[PDB]
Amino acid sequence: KDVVIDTAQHIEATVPLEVIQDMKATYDIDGVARLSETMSQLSSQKVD
Amino acid sequence: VVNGGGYLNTRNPNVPNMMMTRRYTVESFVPIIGRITIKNNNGSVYAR
């Protein structure tokens, strides 16, 4: 019986320059350290 | 300015790019302004 591991769907999140330097300024949001953890939690829930 | 950094160009989107932006605004709180219309200026000093 054969077991294959082929590709899964990628999780993308655009990081523009104007979006990060506004969320860091106004709402004090780390615009990459919050997009990466909401990418990982989406993938880890698609496991379960 | 951003050097490379993933910001693609709009004309030839293959070569590396160097995108530059400049965010600013100019604001008027009270409008203290006057206009001095100068007409017939072609004969300013060389008139007659």
Q: How far is CA A5 from CA A8, A21, A41, A46, in A?
A: 9, 39, 21, 16
Kindly identify which residue of chain A lies nearest to residue B8, measuring between CA atoms: A16
| DSSP notation for A1-48 | ----------------HHHHHHHTTSS---TTTTTTHHHHHHHHHHH-
**A1: CB partners within 8 A, 6+ apart:** none
Method: cryo-EM
What residue type is A14 in one-letter code? T
Kindly identify which residue of chain B lies nearest to residue A14, measuring between CA atoms: B6
Find which of B17, B23, B25 to mutate to test the A interface (most A CBs within 10 Å of its CB): B23
Phi, psi of A14 (to 5 degrees): -70, 140
